[PDB]
């Protein structure tokens, strides 16, 4: 089939890997084990018009385990940026993750996610998330634990790449 290089970045402890794991095996990781450099797992959802394959490049958030930061971004079709709605810090650094990303790939479909929206005491109040406006990005409010807008980040990217604003995930064989 057709596969695209998805680049998943964002601050540490954000939930980037816990997210991929939930899509990969439906398992929810309760513990934090900072991924080193870059772990790449293939994620496949099928649509009404055939199956798609996202070779996800889950990168490291912690500055210490950065690795080849902007080197992982090369040859990417799309991208994801993630922060934590319980840590105002994870958001404040979004412009940065964005920066280095668009300097490598200056034109790719980009999604912006806010994880842990299931936590009652939301810290990054939704009425203050306006970075993606002038940067022509798309935004969702996912929750790796509850699955709030689980596939919406992918579904959205599926269209922006194929060119079919009518694409739909189904759960076929």
């Amino acid at each position: 089939q057709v596969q695209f290089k998805l680049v998943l970045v964002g601050d540490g402890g954000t939930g980037k890997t816990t997210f991929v794991k939930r899509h990969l095996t439906g398992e929810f990781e309760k513990k934090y084990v900072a991924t080193l450099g870059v772990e790449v797992h293939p994620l496949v959802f099928h649509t009404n018009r055939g199956p798609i394959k996202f070779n996800v490049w889950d990168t490291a958030g912690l500055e210490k385990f950065g690795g080849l930061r902007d080197g992982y971004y090369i040859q990417a079709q799309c991208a994801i940026i993630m922060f934590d709605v319980t840590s105002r810090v994870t958001y404040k650094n979004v412009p940065n993750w964005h920066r280095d990303l668009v300097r490598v790939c200056e034109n790719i479909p980009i999604v912006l996610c806010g994880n842990k929206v299931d936590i009652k005491d939301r810290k990054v109040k939704a009425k203050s998330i306006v970075f993606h406006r002038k940067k022509n990005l798309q935004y969702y409010d996912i929750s790796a634990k509850s699955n709030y807008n689980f596939e919406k980040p992918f579904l959205w990217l599926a269209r922006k790449l194929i060119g079919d604003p009518n694409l739909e995930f189904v759960a076929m064989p």
Partner: protein
């Protein structure tokens, strides 16, 4: 595949194979290959050697991966140790960096030849500039405003250069670069920007080169973020942007996002230029958009270059209209475009993409607000400012009712025990949209209920015969009606409801088939639930709605049963007062009959719904304030669960094997989950219930936690994921939620500690220990901090007994890494926060040998990467230092045997690039510690004055771990820790300002920290503590 761990990378040169690494990292590498490929490349970066990169490009290999990688190697060398390269090498790099730039940037065929590589060299060059631009190499700018005027292959690249240089100095200076240096580099460009703006104005007025100009344009948007206003308004720039670029397809978006920034500024001074900008552009849009064209279909089918424009325009309009509502109303000769623009914000205001409709809505909420602040009264005289908008307000009032959002955001999620439940998400973005439309609409209703009621009813009459019918439509409407609740007078509301709820009832007759009669009934039930004020006055009507809900309880048709309980608990809360007190024209209060006939209302309800139903009744039982009565309303309340409960207790008391049957254990989890709900409503008076089953409830919790442990041992830990050990795992956890719950809402601490605590000491804690680690429920720690945070002083004396049972055993699970047993990590330090912040006198009544293991635990806390746990630790430390500063006796003793060591640990965290998150707590504590040094301590850490010792101890401690720091910047830094030791905002910045210096070998001597600048800033702060 091919590459194995044995890979040469020292004292040799194997270029031809370095490629096979990157082509095995960004390519072939399916997993095992690249996992190494990245590692071998990662560990080649810090391996000290800049010159090593020369051959990577000198002997280029057409692998832009390796070259980009070699570039990172060089950028690394510059960002870390540019100050320790003898000048012979500085030029060896400088001349070579710019050399390999022109020999590839001027090449016309380098269009697709790596836009990334070309960009990297720029960043690398900009990096050199950051390390040294005003100091040495002062010609730079002039050497560009002269060498760029040569070829256009050069000019187009020098623009993306200054775009980046501007982004590094102004946009992304804070954090990445030092503080006083940023100000140096900032007003350094602002100093000779007039010399580069000449060339900018030049390339826009003349050059016909498309890419070049697009760059000159794009790379200019960044300047607008800092440049002086003069270069904009006091020159033909605002004009040249609209006339020459705004209309063309390719420069369309670029010029628009420039104006959007300009219009975001205050209008108070250049009122003329803002005026001309508006009209000059508003007309230019008429020549790019027919004022009638369907915008939604221009988006539904249009390339990316088109879609983005619509969004940016939505921004420009929301920007200008909101930031210039002043200049647009007064200036009468501008009303021309004010309406021509308000109309544009109305055509685009109907696109499918949410992120665009949120920009427009943002403005509509603003407009409806400003006109409401003027006069919050309906159309009766004539409004002054509303005139211009009355026409539009109606169009907007429609926009809202037409596209209302689902208020109740609901989702079904499975938890840790596999069981599936329904959750109502809280502050999501979706459930926030409804609140912005509701507010917007509830403004344009207080401005005229008529116009809104007209759109509402006209939508309804068409929802019946007018066959505007559709499941999504009927929904969307009932979201709008249940939106403007209490927006009108109780009278105008009375007729509006009986009008709607009667037309929908007749509509429920027309539409036949259980399928359609459901969606209709639901949208009626919801409308009612959103109008509490109405239900309270008309009891006869209310007495019916609830009864008909007791009807839908039995409707096995999907969705209905859920709606019946949702719409029920909605009313049960807001009208709790009417169910308890006697009603006029009634035998006895209603709640009674509801309890006498409860075995028929839940007759065929899902377990999850039976719970929700009880919680609903719980509120009603609550409104009954009188004690004597409320107690009987509970004995009858919890009458069914107590039959099954006593049934199982009795059935099991004879042969305790009953508690091993998958069914009877599932039911116990169902009973408790009910008590947890009723208690979650009734409150304190629920104690009579909890106290009834308490001893039994614990005797079973104990009997289960054992069977789990035994099952974990003899059969392994994979039994923890099987059906039975799941049900038992829930019964255990729920018992904790009931206890931890009730206490949270208890209001008699002493009675709690005397009666309810003691049993736990044995049945919960002593059992939490006997349990094999992989069976210890962490909810036990949480359900403990909750009763400590609550009780406080009344359990202070029992803390020793608590810790003695759950402290050292829990800590021996989480001290072997920063990962395992996550819940036990968070729950533990939450418990520690409880004891420390309330029962502090309990840390004094314990041997200094135990306390040491406690303070040693808190350090272990804020050394976590678990952003939440790491914060819990810092929370305690600060509250610890404060509670200690109360009893000078144990206080001075504390400053003695710890202060130095603590100040050492809190420093191992600061200088770590993985705790910068909870930094604000660092600065907060480090400040309190250094302010405590100027008075507090009254003894001796070591030989010596006392403060002097710390000012050195810290210094000689930093200089040691970071030897590459000249004894100047270390002296200065330590000084600041006392200067702005009472200004946490700047203190926090002074720390980050240090974490930047330690990342680079600033060389032995350079004097670039700008001492006299950072010094007269610390003295400027030390002198401000007055």
């Amino acid at each position: 595949d091919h590459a194995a761990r044995q890979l040469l990378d020292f004292s040799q040169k194997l270029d031809i194979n370095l490629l096979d690494n990157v082509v095995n990292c960004l390519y072939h590498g399916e997993g095992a290959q690249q996992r190494m490929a990245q590692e071998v490349l990662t560990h080649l970066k810090e391996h000290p050697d800049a010159w090593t990169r020369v051959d990577t490009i000198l002997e280029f290999s057409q692998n832009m991966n390796t070259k980009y990688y070699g570039l990172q190697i060089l950028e690394n060398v510059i960002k870390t140790r540019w100050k320790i390269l003898p000048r012979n090498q500085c030029e060896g790099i400088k001349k070579y960096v710019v050399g390999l730039i022109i020999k590839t940037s001027s090449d016309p065929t380098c269009v697709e030849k790596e836009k990334v590589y070309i960009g990297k060299l720029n960043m690398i060059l900009v990096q050199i500039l950051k390390q040294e631009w005003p100091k040495h190499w002062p010609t730079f700018i002039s050497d560009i405003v002269g060498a760029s005027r040569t070829s256009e292959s050069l000019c187009q690249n020098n623009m993306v250069i200054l775009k980046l240089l501007s982004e590094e100095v102004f946009d992304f200076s804070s954090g990445q670069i030092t503080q006083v240096k940023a100000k140096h580099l900032k007003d350094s460009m602002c100093n000779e920007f007039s010399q580069i703006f000449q060339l900018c104005q030049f390339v826009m007025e003349n050059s016909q080169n498309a890419p070049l100009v697009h760059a000159t344009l794009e790379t200019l948007l960044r300047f607008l973020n800092w440049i002086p206003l003069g270069y904009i308004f006091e020159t033909k720039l605002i004009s040249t942007l609209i006339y020459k670029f705004l209309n063309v397809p390719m420069f369309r978006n670029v010029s628009l996002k420039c104006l959007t920034e300009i219009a975001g500024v205050s209008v108070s001074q250049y009122e003329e230029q803002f005026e001309t900008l508006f009209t000059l552009t508003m007309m230019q849009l008429k020549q790019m958009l027919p004022l009638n064209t369907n915008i939604r279909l221009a988006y539904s089918n249009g390339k990316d270059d088109e879609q983005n424009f619509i969004q940016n325009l939505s921004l420009f309009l929301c920007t200008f209209l909101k930031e210039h509502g002043q200049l647009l109303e007064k200036r009468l000769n501008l009303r021309e475009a004010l309406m021509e623009a308000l109309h544009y914000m109305l055509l685009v205001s109907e696109v499918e993409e949410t992120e665009i409709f949120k920009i427009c809505l943002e403005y509509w909420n603003h407009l409806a607000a400003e006109l409401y602040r003027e006069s919050p009264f309906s159309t009766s005289d004539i409004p002054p400012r509303r005139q211009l908008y009355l026409t539009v307000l109606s169009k907007v009032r429609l926009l809202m009712v037409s596209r209302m959002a689902k208020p109740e955001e609901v989702l079904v999620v499975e938890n840790d025990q596999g069981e599936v439940v329904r959750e109502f998400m809280k502050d999501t973005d979706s459930i926030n949209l409804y609140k912005n439309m509701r507010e917007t609409l509830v403004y344009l209703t207080h401005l005229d209920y008529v116009d809104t009621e007209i759109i509402m009813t006209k939508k309804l009459q068409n929802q019946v015969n007018g066959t505007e019918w559709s499941w999504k439509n009927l929904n969307t409407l009932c979201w709008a009606i249940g939106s403007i609740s209490g927006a009108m007078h109780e009278e105008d509301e009375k007729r509006f409801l009986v009008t709607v709820i009667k037309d929908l009832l007749g509509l429920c007759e027309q539409k036949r088939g259980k399928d359609n009669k459901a969606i209709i009934a639901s949208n009626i039930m919801y409308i009612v639930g959103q109008y509490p004020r109405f239900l309270r006055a008309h009891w006869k009507f209310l007495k019916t709605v609830v009864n008909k809900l007791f009807e839908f309880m039995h409707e096995t048709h999907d969705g209905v049963q859920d709606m019946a309980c949702d719409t029920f608990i909605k009313i049960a809360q807001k009208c709790r007062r009417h169910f308890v007190q006697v009603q006029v024209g009634e035998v006895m209060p209603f709640i009674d009959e509801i309890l006498n006939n409860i075995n028929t209302i839940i007759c065929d309800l899902q377990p999850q719904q039976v719970h929700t139903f009880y919680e609903a009744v719980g509120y009603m039982i609550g409104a009954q304030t009188d004690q004597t009565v409320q107690e009987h309303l509970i004995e009858k309340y919890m009458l069914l669960p107590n039959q099954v409960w006593d049934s199982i207790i009795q059935q099991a008391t004879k042969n305790v094997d009953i508690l091993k049957d998958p069914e009877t254990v599932k039911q116990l989890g169902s009973i408790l989950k009910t008590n947890v709900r009723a208690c979650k409503a009734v409150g304190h008076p629920f104690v009579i219930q909890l106290g009834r089953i308490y001893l039994d409830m614990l005797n079973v919790y104990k009997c289960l936690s054992e069977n789990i442990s035994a099952a974990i041992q003899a059969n392994g830990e994979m039994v923890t994921k099987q059906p039975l050990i799941r049900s038992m795992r829930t019964v255990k956890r729920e018992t904790l939620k009931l206890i931890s719950g009730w206490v949270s809402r208890s209001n008699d601490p002493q009675m709690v500690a005397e009666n309810f605590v003691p049993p736990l000491l044995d049945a919960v804690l002593i059992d939490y220990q006997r349990n094999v680690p992989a069976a210890r429920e962490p909810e036990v720690l949480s359900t403990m901090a909750i009763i400590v945070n609550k009780l406080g002083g009344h359990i202070t004396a029992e803390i020793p007994q608590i810790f003695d049972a759950v402290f050292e055993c829990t800590l021996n699970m989480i001290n072997k890494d920063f990962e395992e047993y996550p819940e036990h990590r968070t729950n533990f330090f939450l418990l520690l926060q409880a004891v420390n912040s309330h029962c502090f006198p309990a840390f004094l009544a314990i041997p200094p040998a135990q306390f040491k293991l406690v303070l040693d635990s808190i350090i272990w806390a804020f050394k976590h990467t678990m952003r939440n746990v790491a914060d819990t630790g810092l929370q305690i430390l600060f509250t610890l230092l404060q509670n200690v500063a109360q009893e000078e006796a144990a206080a001075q003793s504390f400053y003695q045997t710890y202060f130095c060591d603590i100040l050492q640990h809190i420093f191992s965290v600061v200088t770590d690039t993985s705790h910068t998150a909870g930094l604000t707590m660092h600065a907060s504590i480090l400040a309190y510690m250094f302010n405590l040094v100027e008075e507090g301590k009254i003894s001796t850490p070591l030989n010596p004055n006392n403060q002097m010792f710390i000012q050195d101890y810290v210094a000689n401690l930093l200089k040691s771990a970071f030897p590459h720091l000249q004894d100047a910047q270390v002296k200065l830094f330590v000084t600041g820790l006392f200067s702005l030791n009472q200004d946490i905002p700047a203190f926090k910045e002074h720390l980050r300002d240090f974490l930047v210096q330690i990342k680079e070998f600033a060389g032995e001597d350079t004097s670039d920290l700008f001492l006299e600048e950072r010094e007269t800033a610390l003295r400027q702060a030390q002198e401000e503590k007055h």
